[PDB]
Amino acid sequence: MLTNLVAEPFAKLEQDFGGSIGVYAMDTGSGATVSYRAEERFPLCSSFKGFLAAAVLARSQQQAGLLDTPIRYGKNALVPWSPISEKYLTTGMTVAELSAAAVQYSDNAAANLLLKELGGPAGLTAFMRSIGDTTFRLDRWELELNSAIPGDARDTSSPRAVTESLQKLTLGSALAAPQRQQFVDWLKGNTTGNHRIRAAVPADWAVGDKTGTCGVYGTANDYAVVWPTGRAPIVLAVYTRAPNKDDKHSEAVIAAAARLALEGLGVNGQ
Numbered sequence: 001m002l003t004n005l006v007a008e009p010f011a012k013l014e015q016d017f018g019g020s021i022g023v024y025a026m027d028t029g030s031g032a033t034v035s036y037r038a039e040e041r042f043p044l045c046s047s048f049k050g051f052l053a054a055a056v057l058a059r060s061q062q063q064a065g066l067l068d069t070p071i072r073y074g075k076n077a078l079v080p081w082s083p084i085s086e087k088y089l090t091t092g093m094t095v096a097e098l099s100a101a102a103v104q105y106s107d108n109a110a111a112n113l114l115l116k117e118l119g120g121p122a123g124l125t126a127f128m129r130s131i132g133d134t135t136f137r138l139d140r141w142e143l144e145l146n147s148a149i150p151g152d153a154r155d156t157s158s159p160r161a162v163t164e165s166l167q168k169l170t171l172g173s174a175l176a177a178p179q180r181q182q183f184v185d186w187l188k189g190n191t192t193g194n195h196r197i198r199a200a201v202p203a204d205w206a207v208g209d210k211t212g213t214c215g216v217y218g219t220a221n222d223y224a225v226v227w228p229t230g231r232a233p234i235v236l237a238v239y240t241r242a243p244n245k246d247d248k249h250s251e252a253v254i255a256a257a258a259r260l261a262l263e264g265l266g267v268n269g270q
């Protein structure tokens with residue numbers, strides 16, 4: 001009834017990109033949605049790290065002091081693209097600091113350390129099942145989860161399930177109130193997304209996001225909660241892939257798809 005009330009040229013955008021774009025956007029006030037390839041699977045890439053941090057926050061509700069726990073690690077724990085954890089190799093970091101690094105810098109070593117805390121990819125998947133997400137699956141660790149192989153369901157979800165779970169965690173009741181605001185605050189402090197959904201969002205609106213870039217198969221993504229002033233928040237997810245291993249990802253295409261999603265919802269923006 002309220003899905004795709006206004007058609008938007010997503011097909012032309014993905015054809016110009018040379019791949020596939022998946023979009024799901026939800027106006028949490030009216031329930032209206034924009035949906036394009038929204039139930040297809042796309043690789044999560046580093047976007048799983050947002051849900052990883054939420055799963056850590058959920059575990060901290062039953063294990064008080066978890067966030068403050070100092071974690072030491074060896075050089076063998078470093079993974080290419082660990083921009084924060086490499087600076088604390090000789091000191092260690094807290095669980096909360098690792099979580100913030102995973103969310104805000106996509107830190108790979110931090111992500112693997114936190115996955116170990118949860119019992120691995122199946123532990124994160126179990127958390128997602130516990131909030132009602134039956135689509136999400138994490139199967140591997142960094143960096144193997146970035147292979148983005150066409151047709152491979154490992155380490156994928158759908159734009160719709162990403163958006164639905166993001167809404168539950170940032171705006172609904174999946175986390176207790178203090179943990180919910182901490183998750184929002186980590187997303188708001190993200191540093192990796194300035195050229196993606198944020199580039200479609202006016203500077204005077206609040207926004208938290210989590211990006212991912214697999215590095216192959218034109219595969220990259222971003223999901224976000226956006227608070228336009230004077231109306232209810234919008235939750236959205238934009239995922240891309242492409243058929244050839246050497247196909248380039250495009251941040252501009254992600255920003256453009258986000259613009260179309262906001263336009264389709266009737267949200268006056270840029």
Ligand SMILES: *[B@@]1([O])O[C]([C]C([O])=O)[C][C][C]1[N]C(=O)[C]C1=[C][C]=[C]S1
Pocket residue numbers: 044045046047080081105106108143146192210211212213214215
């Ligand atoms: B992850 O999938 O994405 C991060 C970048 C982001 O958030 O958009 C970087 C770490 C992960 N990616 C990889 O390890 C492979 C890389 C692709 C580009 C730079 S590192």
